[PDB]
Amino acid sequence: TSCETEGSSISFTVEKAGHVVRFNCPSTLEEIKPAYEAGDSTKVCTTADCSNEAALKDVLKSASLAQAEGSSGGNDFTLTVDALPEAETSVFFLCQRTGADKCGVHILVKAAPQAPVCSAQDHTLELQITAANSDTSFVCGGTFNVIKPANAAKVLQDSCETEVDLVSLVPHASRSALEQSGLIKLSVTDLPQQQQKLCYRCEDSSQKACKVLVTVSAS
């Protein structure tokens, strides 16, 4: 929690999307470096000594840094990372005296785990959406590289053979694809009023399929 010790360092890890780290610059070394600014204006250090800096937004696309009054006091900071970065990445701060003998904060943000693969006939890959404002991702891999329905607005309704509009089951949900990698992403904002089960097919050229079933939790 608190960066108490002059000349020392504290560290933390964000290991899952949506996880948070809180640390404290105490009343004795109350001032954070880079100087705190909220939302799009936040800056982080990119070396431990804080001789190097960048915008948080250029280091971690979906992170935020919050500030609140401290406990043995000073200031509390909360970093949330919504989506993990592609590669492992470190951010840094110092706690120092106002107006500036300093204490260092090192935060490691793990690389996003790579997406589960549906690469074998008649297997079912079972995925879950349980919170608002989340996504789940999978790859149509191996020889099962054709996403079905091909049309991103469409989804299949666990027998997986009837096509319907995705927003006919989960209003506001959308499907997106990184076609060079086979990666498909299902995203939702608000949860549907009743639990749904979405199905997609990762098919080979002969239309055999690995099946992907997403349970979307009720609001």
Q: What is the 3-state secondary structure (H, E, C) of the chain?
A: CECCCCCCEEEEEECCCCEEEEEEECHHHCEEECCCCCHHHCEEECCCCCCCEEEHHHHCCCEEEEEEECCCCCEEEEEEECCCCCCCEEEEEEEECCCCCCEEEEEEECCCCCCCEECCCCCEEEEEECCCCEEEEEEECCCCCEEECCCCCEEECCCCCCEEEHHHCCCCCEEEEECCCCEEEEEECCCCCCCEEEEEEEECCCCCEEEEEEEECCC
End-to-end Cα, the chain, rounded Å: 34
Which of these, 90, 117, 119, 115, lies nearest to 105 by C-alpha position? 90
Distance CA 9, CA 6 (A): 8
Tokens of 4: 């108490």
The Cα 166–Cα 151 span in angstroms is: 10
The C-alpha atoms of residue 129 and residue 115 are separated, in whole angstroms, by 14
Return the structure tokens found at 137.
């991702």
Domain ranges of the chain: 1-114, 115-219
Which method was used?
A: X-ray
Domain 1-114 top-level CATH class = mainly beta
What's the CATH class of domain 115-219? mainly beta
Which residues does 14 contact at the CB level (< 8 Å), separation at least 6? 20, 21, 79, 81, 84, 107, 108, 109, 110
Dihedral sign computed on CA atoms, order 127, 161, 175, 88: positive
Cα–Cα distance measured from residue 80 to residue 18, given in angstroms and rounded to the nearest whole number: 6
Q: Which residue has the tokens 């990372």?
A: 81
Task: Give me the amino acid identity at 152.
Answer: A
Q: 1-114 with 115-219: one CATH topology? A: yes
Bridge partners for 175 per DSSP: 186
Residues 6+ apart with CB under 8 A from 65: 36, 38, 42, 44, 56, 77, 78, 79
**Which amino acid is residue 81, in one-letter code?**
V
Class of residue 213 by CB neighbours under 10 A (exposed 0-12, middle 13-18, buried 19+):
middle
Resolution in A: 2.2
Single-letter residue type at 166: L
The whole-angstrom separation of Cα 69 and Cα 57 is 24
